[PDB]
Design a binder for this molecule. Structure first.
Ligand SMILES: N=C(N)N1CCCCC1
Lengths: 247, 10
């Protein structure tokens, strides 16, 4: 996250931290995600496509720090890793960048809400907030485009939804933005998601509910003028989601 | 890796 503020998991209790275990026994951070029901975390397919084996992944909930333990955190294995069959990576952009992780503890329990863990609501099918609505993004992504290290404490910031019309201007993204994506950015281009925030939530109030509107997908630099963050449009994927969350 | 990836691994 570029700019914004350090936060804790209590202020973003649906946030899931996903890590991968390597052959050496080393474990490194992969992507963010969001807890949409006790047994299900939603993220991006680009995170997993290079190594799509469920066994190699660990999901933490209730975690406020990247490489140290938070009190109240809970560790889960991945019972199913579900990538979208129509995922593709374009020269600039990703398409259908959405993934589901069914989580289970070694004990066999799904998530249990607490001070530090809660689900986030899904939007109604094809229902989004209007352009200019303020939304929240959260993650352990870089604080600067040029950084080599990731922040150890969770960060969040506010961005505003951008119209499809505006996002499609060629000085923005031109043809590469589709209606299955949402753009969002700071009106002065001062704060943004960045490398390592991918898979994480874009959360907007829609009606009276904190709602998962976007999943962090792609963008050129971070906080760079005329280049918004691009997000998977969650409202366009409910059938896909419900087909899997029924088991 | 797309040129505008945000993945740690890109
Ligand atoms: N919003 C920006 N700038 N991003 C989104 C996440 C990938 C890195 C670039």
């Amino acid at each position: 996250i570029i700019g914004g503020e350090f936060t804790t998991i209590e202020n973003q209790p649906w946030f899931a931290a996903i890590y991968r275990r390597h052959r050496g026994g080393s474990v490194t951070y992969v992507c963010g995600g969001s807890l949409i029901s006790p047994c299900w975390v939603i993220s991006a397919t680009h995170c997993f496509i290079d190594y799509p084996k469920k066994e190699d992944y660990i999901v933490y909930l209730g975690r406020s720090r990247l490489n140290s333990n938070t009190q109240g955190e809970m560790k889960f294995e991945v019972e199913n890793l579900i990538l979208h069959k129509d995922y593709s990576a374009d020269t600039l952009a990703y398409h259908n960048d959405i993934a589901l992780l069914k989580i289970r503890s070694k004990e066999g329990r799904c998530a249990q809400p607490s001070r530090t863990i809660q689900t986030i609501a899904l939007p109604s099918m094809y229902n989004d907030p209007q352009f200019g609505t303020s939304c929240e993004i959260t993650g352990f992504g870089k604080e600067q485009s040029t950084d080599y290290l990731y922040p150890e404490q969770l960060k969040m910031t506010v961005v505003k939804l951008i119209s499809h019309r505006e996002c499609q201007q060629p000085h923005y993204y031109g043809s590469e933005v589709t209606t299955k994506m949402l753009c969002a950015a700071d009106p002065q281009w001062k704060t943004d998601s960045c490398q390592g925030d991918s898979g994480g939530p874009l959360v907007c109030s829609l009606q009276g509910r904190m709602t998962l509107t976007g999943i962090v997908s792609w963008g050129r630099g971070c906080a760079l003028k005329d280049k918004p963050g691009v997000y998977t449009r969650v409202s366009h994927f409910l059938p896909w989601i419900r087909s899997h969350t029924k088991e | 890796c797309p040129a505008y990836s945000a993945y740690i691994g890109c």
